[PDB]
Amino acid sequence: VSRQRQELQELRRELEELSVGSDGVLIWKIGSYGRRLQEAKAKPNLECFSPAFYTHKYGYKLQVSAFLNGNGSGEGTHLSLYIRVLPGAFDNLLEWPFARRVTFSLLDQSDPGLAKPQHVTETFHPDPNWKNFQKPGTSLGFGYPKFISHQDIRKRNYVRDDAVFIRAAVEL
Amino acid sequence: RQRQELQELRRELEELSVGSDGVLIWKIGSYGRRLQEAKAKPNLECFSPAFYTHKYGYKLQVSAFLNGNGSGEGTHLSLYIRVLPGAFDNLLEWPFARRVTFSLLDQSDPGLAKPQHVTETFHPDPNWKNFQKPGTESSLGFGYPKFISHQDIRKRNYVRDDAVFIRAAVEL
Amino acid sequence: SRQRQELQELRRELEELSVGSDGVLIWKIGSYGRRLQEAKAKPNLECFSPAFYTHKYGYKLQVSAFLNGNGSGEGTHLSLYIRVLPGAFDNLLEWPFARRVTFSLLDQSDPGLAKPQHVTETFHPDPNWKNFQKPGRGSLDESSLGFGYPKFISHQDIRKRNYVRDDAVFIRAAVELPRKILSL
Ligand SMILES: [Cl-]
Ligand SMILES: [Cl-]
Ligand SMILES: [Cl-]
């Protein structure tokens, strides 16, 4: 029994090391949007987390997070989006502070052949003085409290089939 | 209980099945045994792992009747493809209209002699219901009931070490 | 047993997903100090990288290391080797394996503040080395195959710079990939 469980834990860890951006891109699907939005309205600062992902194979380990009902200046009125640098297996091989351009998008879920998608996008340029980007060891989220308002999110296909797509594109 | 813990990992592995520059290579092992099973069970269809054409692309699945079906029954290998519901469907153009190239690979040492692959190409038919957006008649896929005859498959190295390779290249 | 069979099937599926990143495998060897002491006590003690495909539908390779050395490097050097393993796509490939291989022991220094001085060896696989031949049966069944460097880096040199950092070493194997085609 102990062997089968240690085996499952080993495979789960292996799967997590396979979470890697595609040309620096992570697309995070937040399902059950309708329910999760009501949970966030009942509990201020309830945060959703993406799976951890490597920017590129043997790169930085990052994690996207979202407040469906918002946080800080966006609390109760906006979707808020953040990213964090996590301790990664290959940190000693990397340049510090983390200084890669990060592009956040909330995807417009429209068929591109029928209508041009109108994604909500913002490009983050890390400040080398912010502690957030320093080598882990030697949370620290960085992002936007007012990414998209509750009124604006209903104006395009940002929510479709009770799901939203958050895109984080890291310049490699 | 653990059947679903294992099914969670199996589902994640399926999400990691992605074409290499739009290419899926599907190995059908135990050819002799499976061919005999196909002769005894005419509705016996082999399925490839499901795969994404590209990261965040269309989810497809290749299938084969080793003893053939329809007009190829008992005389040919029949090859088909289907669109399956994918996690990113709302981001894609519909109907699926990307050129698909099927090849049965000649397993000849390329350093010795030029392998003579058996190849067919098609542009997906917009009137084929399965090429339309999933969720929006026969359960059969789209393809070739007469891909290669049983006489031709025994020539060259189409069957080698009791295995055949099916290649499906999707124009990205 | 049914769940145990399922675990081994998933483990095989995960191995098929071990693919180099643009032909690159980076292998982290943790607990370096302890493993060096174990290797001093057991001369044949060999560390193995996970098996990996050079590229999707490519060659299956595996890197190996003797922390206390093998052959001419025994007791004085780290020895590095690579071998071809039976892969699912072997019958579609050119044999013998002839793609350029570059081995590196990584100097774990921040590249932005100091130039890391990696220890490197490059080679064009010799067509006469039995391992680089197509994998696969005779009455003689042994494991002596892999080509390499018995004297990759000396024990004196590995203690310089940042080759060992946080009790770990990084071994890099970069393999030459098929060239992309372009129509003019
Ligand atoms: Cl730092
Ligand atoms: Cl995908
Ligand atoms: Cl150390």
Author numbering:
A (entry chain A): 285 to 422, 431 to 464
B (entry chain C): 287 to 422, 429 to 464
C (entry chain B): 286 to 421, 424 to 471
Authors' text:
TRAF4 belongs to the TRAF family that is composed of seven members in humans. TRAF4 is a modular protein composed of a RING domain, seven TRAF-type zinc-fingers, and a TRAF domain. In this study, we show that TRAF4 uses its TRAF domain as a novel PIP-binding module. To conclude, TRAF4 acts both as a negative regulator of TJs and a cell migration promoter.
The structure was refined to convergence (Rwork = 0.1632, Rfree = 0.1995) and includes residues 283–470 of the TRAF domain. No evidence was seen, however, for the presence of IP4 in the electron density maps. The most striking structural feature of the TRAF domain is the formation of a mushroom-shaped trimer with the coiled-coil domain (TRAF-N) as the stalk and the TRAF-C domain as the cap, which is similar to the described structure of the TRAF domain of TRAF2 and TRAF5. The structural architecture of the TRAF-C domain contains an eight-stranded antiparallel β-sandwich and a three turn helix present in the crossover connection between two β-strands as previously described for TRAF2, TRAF3, and TRAF6 proteins. Altogether, this shows that the recombinant TRAF domain of TRAF4 is well folded and trimerizes in solution similarly to the TRAF domains of TRAF2 and TRAF6. In addition, it can bind up to three PI(3,4,5)P3 molecules, thus suggesting that each TRAF monomer has a binding site for one PIP molecule. We also verified that the overall structure of the K345E mutant was unaffected using gel filtration and dynamic light scattering and showed that this mutant had an organization similar to the WT protein corresponding to a soluble trimer. This mutagenesis study showed that two positive amino acids, lysine 313 and lysine 345, are contributing and essential residues for the binding of TRAF4 to PIPs, respectively. In the model, which was further refined by energy minimization of the fully hydrated protein–ligand complex, the PI(3,4,5)P3-diC4 molecule binds to the TRAF domain at the interface between two protomers. Indeed, the lipid interacts with lysine 313 from one protomer and lysine 345 from the adjacent protomer. Lysine 313 directly interacts with both phosphates at positions 3 and 4 of the PI(3,4,5)P3-diC4, whereas lysine 345 only binds the phosphate at position 5.
